[PDB]
Structure 1
Amino acid sequence: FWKKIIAYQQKLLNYFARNFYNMRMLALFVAFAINFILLFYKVSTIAVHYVLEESSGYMEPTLRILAILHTVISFFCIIGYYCLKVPLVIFKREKEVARKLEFDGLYITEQPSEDDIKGQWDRLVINTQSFPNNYWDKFVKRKVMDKYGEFYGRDRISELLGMDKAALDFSDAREKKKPKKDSSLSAVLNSIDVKYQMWKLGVVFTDNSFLYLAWYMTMSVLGHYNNFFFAAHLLDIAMGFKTLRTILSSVTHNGKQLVLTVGLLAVVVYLYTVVAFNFFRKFYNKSEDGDTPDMKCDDMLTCYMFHMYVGVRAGGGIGDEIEDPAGDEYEIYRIIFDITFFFFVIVILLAIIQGLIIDAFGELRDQQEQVKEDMETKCFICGIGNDYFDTVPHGFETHTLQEHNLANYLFFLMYLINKDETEHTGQESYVWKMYQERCWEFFPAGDCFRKQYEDQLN
């Protein structure tokens, strides 16, 4: 029956959500196993073959089982993502749209600039009847109505929010009894909101991590056809290991600067190629045998490609590659050309790139130290210096861990949300009203209990 099968389904989905991370790491383990077993891959001998050398004789079934397991684990990771991370993203976007609607009116007093696909897509969800699905405040459709009902018209706000104000009057009046049961497939289909699920699927497809996991799926599926597609799964270490993520964030912190440096290097070498094309043409003769002339700089594109591929990679420069200038009219100009090329392209630009990378390391370290000493010298909420509290022994730690703990503030927010609105105390109601109007004045700023009651306490 329905109530048992749905319960077991919920148990399975919860299991996947719980084991999402473990299977994410174990998929990487399987990837390293398949790549290690592919380390013995060999080309057999036009007819082109591909067969593994199996010393034990069971390597082929081994990586076949490994590939099937990796593909199944990919499906389980796809399921676990939708179990665990998708609700958080949906809650974030849904609450953001709700706040923009109630406080900014992005669909009544404002309209999306048509370059924001997020807003253009979220225009659909307001009409749905399954809104605040994840956001706790189911009262946003009434807050917007009370706030903006008169200036745009109850009818227009009701049509935009897709609410049955006409049925509200009939509901408050005598409403006839109707048979209703969830056992009916038609009934459960009507309960399912097609448009809200459409919006949710759009959001999930837009989500970046879901796209990465789908790419992982596609690469595993293609790896079944061609076993060497499994190598791309090693690109998951960047996200699996945060220690490697620091090293990668070092170079990606100044990624724009590095890309611009590479572009400048490509432009300077193009200018040098133009100079060579204008003056130093016979010098670029690369013919090993004098009988067959092979000129690398007769054409602009060929000369530029040669400059890149050879000079940029060569340690000495383009001079150590192209012919010697001795006993020629352009000897001194050629020498100056080579020296300038070596100093600018080979030395300075590479020095620029390495210095950018090192400066990125330094900036990241300074940012971490800044965060550290900021936390250790200023209270997060109070903003008061540590010395004033430290006038009493362990005063700063007492203030930061007992009086003004951000964990305590978060737990108070949870307590207010979980508690029923009717049993709110005076302070609870006061803070709840300012939280619902999004006024953060109740948070202590610059003053504390010790400051206010200093001479009474001391």
Structure 2
Amino acid sequence: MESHKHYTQSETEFLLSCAETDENETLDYEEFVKRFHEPAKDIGFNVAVLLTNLSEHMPNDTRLQTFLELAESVLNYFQPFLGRIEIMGSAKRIERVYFEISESSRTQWEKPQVKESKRQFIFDVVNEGGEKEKMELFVNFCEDTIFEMQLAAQIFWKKIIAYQQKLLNYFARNFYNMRMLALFVAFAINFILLFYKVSVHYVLEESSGYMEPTLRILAILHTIISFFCIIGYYCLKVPLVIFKREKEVARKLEFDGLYITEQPSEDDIKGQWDRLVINTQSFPNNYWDKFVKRKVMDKYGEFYGRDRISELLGMDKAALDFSDAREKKKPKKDSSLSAVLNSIDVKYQMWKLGVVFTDNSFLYLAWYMTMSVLGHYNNFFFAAHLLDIAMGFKTLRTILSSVTHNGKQLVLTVGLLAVVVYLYTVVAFNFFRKFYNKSEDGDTPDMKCDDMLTCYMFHMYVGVRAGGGIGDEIEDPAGDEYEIYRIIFDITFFFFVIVILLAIIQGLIIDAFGELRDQQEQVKEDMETKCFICGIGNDYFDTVPHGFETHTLQEHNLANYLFFLMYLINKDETEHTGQESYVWKMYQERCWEFFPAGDCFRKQYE
């Protein structure tokens, strides 16, 4: 401690004065730091927040300058522990509030799935969401993310359950690695299936042993890995989506009265599926708000009937359960002795199944599993697993979303194409029917136009795909009886169908791909040259070196805002400061006017 260049002799002797000397000349540094560091850390963080507030408010004071050099000598330890937010409220001015950030919160934020959720939120809030619901979506994302961080941190009856929990946690932790291994095994199976031949009798001929049994080995391994992937997903991401839906339906019940006063429509299947379990037993299982039932009861009980509310919301004959629990409640209760199973609520379980079977990703993994099962029957069904790279990469997802994007325009252009092909078909069927003789020697003429449906199909199957119309494959007229009419027909066909409509669908898909790529680049450039919270711009902060960088990484950090919301939630109110209590009241009343809309600390002060 005297040679590590971080202590002078006075400090070294002051620190040896704190020794224990347990009669053998030995100190236990373990208990030393377990006893002498935690309160020191807490009060040091408090005084560091005080000094940082004083610094960021009153600059350029030599006495405060030495105070600040000592302050930063201390802050070199509390830099990753203090966070700052710019609130706008209760004073008509920007206020820099400070708070504590937990190492656990930092780790759970550094977790991968949290980063994936963050990038997805950024993308779908800059693409679709504007500025009226931007803060709404951001606060919803913060809530979903703190729930996801809690889940990631969480990641005879006492012998099987404690092991199945560990197994599910391991699967949820290695879900992504399971996906990569599944992709690699699928590529291997497809390579082996490429090394193939036929004799009516399928055999893998191109190799000499060591390749037939490994195919079945990799097939059963891929099936096992697909089952492991779906099991890990069901315990890693299903909690998040069911929590989102529970929060949505609970807030619709509380604020809007979706199933009390403004009953949903008949086409919205989501409304009906939520009405299915607005009255279940354990309705808020993941929203951590087990009192939305009593809240909506107290809100809509004196107008629509308290008994009616209690029967439509579940928990019948328990309108006095609150008073019974407030006055001489029961201490506890054993689970059961004869009812080991069926304790769960079948209604809520069916609701969970119905919400996971329309997740658009659980469905993808289910299709993956069924394709593996079918590949066990016929090995060539493992080729469908090669499409996993299209969903794994970015620009491939862009191509797929492009071919899906202009869906209605594509379908209607294809319909118009079919209609012009049908019109050209009927004119060729009436007039130019002696020219559709597809034979070289015969002598049996293979007339493709001597039937309406066959002629229409020959048209839609040759004339659309000949690249030069339809006349370049059937016989040339070469006779002054229908020459001019036949040529005008063929040139009009090659004009409207080949170089116009086919080109229209081509350009439709190409422009959809270009638009999707261009929106992605615009989202990237907006995140790179514009602030998310305030959105003042980049040239304003491009005055001091790294100005915009420090502004977006210190003052208006989305991670800092999320950590501040987590701190307010875990703050144990009646201990909030003025600004913290104000922000908490705004968050409870769902107003979000405390975000800096068109101002920042630099724009407000010097």
Asked if TM exceeds 0.5, the reply is: yes
Secondary structure, aligned partner of 2:216? helix
Shift of 1:371: 2.5
CA distance in 1, matches of 2:317, 2:570: 29
- The answer to whether the Cα contact below 8 Å between 1:37 and 1:59 also exists between their aligned partners in 2 is yes
The Cα shift of 1:255 comes to 3.9
| In 2: Cα distance, 1:132 partner to 1:120 partner | 17
Moved more, 164-173 or 296-305: 164-173
CA distance in structure 2 between the partners assigned to 1:367 and 1:116 by the alignment? 30
Query: In 1, are the aligned partners of 2:187 and 2:386 still within 8 Å (CA)?
Result: yes
Deviation at 1:130? 1.1
Q: CA deviation at 1:183?
A: 6.6
With over 3 angstroms needed to count, the CA separation of the structure-2 counterparts of 1:143 and 1:10, relative to structure 1, is same
The aligned residue for residue 135 of structure 2 is none
Q: CA 1:232–1:369 in 2, change beyond 3 Å: closer, same or farther? A: closer
Partner residue in 2 for 1:20: 175
For each residue in 1:52-106, what CA deviation from the matched residue of structure 2 results, as whole angstroms up to 9, or x when unmatched? 2163323221111111111111211121111111111101111110111111111
1:165 is paired with a residue whose SS is: coil
Q: Is the 8 A contact 2:196 2:206 kept in 1?
A: no
Q: In 2 relative to 1, CA 360–80 (structure 1 residues): closer, same or farther, beyond 3 Å?
A: same
Assess if the C-alpha contact under 8 Å between 1:182 and 1:188 holds in 2. Answer: no
Change (3 A) 1:317 1:54: closer
Contact 2:186–2:386, Cα closer than 8 Å, also in 1: yes
Task: Indicate how the Cα distance of structure 1 residues 120 and 421 shifts in structure 2: closer, same or farther if over 3 A, else same.
Answer: same
The answer on whether the counterparts of 2:197 and 2:206 sit within 8 Å (CA) in structure 1 is no
CA distance in 2, matches of 1:232, 1:362: 27
CA deviation digits over 1:183-222, x for unaligned, max 9? 7454554653332222212222232222222222222222
Hey, what's the Cα distance between the residues in 2 that align with 1:176 and 1:428? 35
Contact 1:377 / 1:385 at 8 angstroms: preserved in 2? Answer: yes
Measure the CA separation in 2 of the matches of 1:155 and 1:288: 86
Report deviation, 1:168: 3.8
* Mapping of residues 178-193 of structure 1, within 5 Å: 184-186=336-338, 189=341, 191-193=343-345
Deviation track 1:224-257 (CA, whole Å, cap 9, x = no partner) reads: 1222222222222221222422333343333443
Of the three residues 315, 320, 323, the one matched with 2:467 is 315
Q: What is the distance in 2 between the residues matched to 1:146 and 1:63?
A: 64
- The 10-residue stretch of structure 1 (132-141 or 182-191) with the greater mean CA deviation from structure 2: 182-191
TM score, norm. by length of structure 2? 0.69
Q: CA RMSD in A?
A: 2.6
Question: Which one is further off, 9-18 or 316-325?
Answer: 316-325
Q: What is the count of residue pairs matched by the alignment? A: 451
With 135-144 and 119-128 compared, the bigger mean Cα shift is at 135-144
Moved more, 264-273 or 9-18: 264-273
Give the superposition deviation at 1:411.
1.3
CA distance in 2, matches of 1:333, 1:243: 48
> Matches of 1:263 and 1:190 in 2, distance apart?
54
SS at match of 1:119: helix
After superposition, what is the alpha-carbon deviation per residue over 1:417-444, rounded to whole angstroms, capped at 9, x for unaligned?
Answer: 2333343333222222221221111112
| Residue from 367, 373, 380 that aligns with 1:228 | 380
- The verdict on how the C-alpha distance between 1:388 and 1:29 changes in structure 2, with shifts beyond 3 A counting, is closer
d(CA) in 2 for partners of 1:189, 1:63: 41
After superposition, the C-alpha distances for 1:262-291 in whole angstroms (9 at most, x for unaligned) are 222222111111111121111122243363
Contact 1:145 1:154 in 2 (8 A): yes
Q: Cα 1:170–1:91, aligned 2, differ >3 Å: closer, same or farther?
A: closer
User: What is the CA-CA distance between 1:338 and the residue it aligns to?
Assistant: 1.6
Equivalent pair of 1:382/1:446 in contact (CA under 8 Å): yes
CA distance in 1: counterparts of 2:195 and 2:546, whole angstroms: 62
Contact (CA 8 Å) 1:54, 1:60: kept in 2 or not? no
| Preserved CA contact (<8 Å) 1:181 1:187 | no
Bigger CA drift: 255-264 or 8-17? 255-264
Structure-1 separation of matches of 2:215 and 2:325? 69
Deviates more, 1:71-80 or 1:395-404: 395-404
CA drift at 1:333: 1.1
SS in 1 for 2:357: helix
Change (3 A) 1:446 1:179: closer
Could you say what secondary structure the match of 2:441 adopts?
Answer: coil
Tell me, in whole angstroms, the C-alpha distance in 2 between the residues paired with 1:183 and 1:137.
23
SS at match of 2:545: coil
Check conservation: 2:284, 2:290, Cα contact below 8 A: yes
Bigger Cα displacement from structure 2, 386-395 vs 78-87: 386-395
Q: 1:190 to 1:354 in 2, by over 3 A?
A: closer
Aligned-pair CA distance for 1:319 = 0.8
> In the alignment, does 2:170 pair up with 1:5?
no
Distance change in 2, residues 1:28/1:377 (3 Å): closer
* 1:137 shift after superposition: 2.4
Higher mean alpha-carbon deviation, 144-153 vs 393-402, is at 393-402
* Per-residue deviation, 1:370: 2.8
* Corresponding position: 1:216 with 2:216: no
SS of structure 2 residue aligned to 1:320: coil
- 1:176 Cα deviation after fit: 8.4
**Contact kept? 2:198, 2:205, Cα under 8 Å:** no
Following TM superposition, by how much is the alpha carbon of 1:297 offset from its aligned partner in structure 2, in angstroms?
1.0
* TM-superposition CA deviations, 1:13-59 (whole Å, max 9, x none): 00000111111121122122112111233333xxx322221633232
Q: Give 1:390 deviation, angstroms.
A: 3.5
Q: Is the 8 A contact 1:310 1:318 kept in 2?
A: yes
How high is the TM-score relative to the length of structure 1? 0.90
After superposition, the Cα gap between the structure-2 partners of 1:152 and 1:96, relative to the gap in structure 1 and judged at 3 Å, is: same
Say if 1:178 and 1:452 are closer, same or farther in 2 by CA, change over 3 A. Answer: closer
Partner-residue secondary structure (3-state), 2:461: helix
Query: How big is each residue's C-alpha offset from its partner over 1:340-363, in whole Å with a ceiling of 9 and x where there is no partner?
Result: 222222222333233233323432
Residues of 1 paired with 2:514 and 2:330: CA distance?
71
Match in the other structure for 2:426: 274
**Stretch moving more, 4-13 or 288-297:** 288-297
Q: Which runs of no fewer than 5 residues in structure 2 stay unpaired?
A: 1-155
Of 429-438 and 163-172, more deviation after overlay is shown by 163-172
- Residues 189 and 215 of structure 2 are in contact (CA less than 8 Å); yes or no, is this contact kept in structure 1? yes
CA distance in 2, matches of 1:170, 1:450: 51
1:25–1:240 contact (8 Å) kept in structure 2 = no
- Unaligned runs of 5+ residues in structure 1 are none
What residue is the counterpart of 1:433 in the other structure?
Answer: 585
Q: Deviations over 1:303-361 (max 9, x none)?
A: 11011111112123211111111123110111111222222222223332332333234
Secondary structure at 2:361 match in 1: helix
Q: Is the 8 A contact 2:534 2:599 kept in 1?
A: yes
Tell me whether 198-207 or 61-70 shows the greater mean CA deviation: 198-207
Question: What is the aligned-residue identity percentage?
Answer: 100
Equivalent-residue separation in structure 1 for 2:266 and 2:279 (angstroms): 19
* 2:339 aligned counterpart, secondary structure: helix
Deviation of residue 175 (structure 1)?
8.1
Return the structure number with greater helix share.
1
